[PDB]
Amino acid sequence: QCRRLCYKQRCVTYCRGR
């Protein structure tokens, strides 16, 4: 499962595989 991490007026998609 992939979760999005938003920080500093920003948003990016993250994945356990990464």
Name the descriptors.
18 residues, Beta hairpin motif, mainly beta, toxin, Peptides, monomer
Written account of the structure:
It is a single chain. This protein is mostly beta strands. 0% of the residues lie in helices and 56% in strands. It has no helices and 2 strands. The chain has a two-stranded antiparallel sheet with strand order 1-2.
Brief synopsis:
This protein is mainly beta. The protein has no helices and two strands. The protein has a two-stranded antiparallel sheet with strand order 1-2.
What layout of secondary structure does this protein have?
Blueprint: E1 2-6, E2 11-15
Antiparallel strand pairs: 1-2
PDB class: toxin
Keywords: Peptides, Beta hairpin motif, toxin
Assembly: monomeric
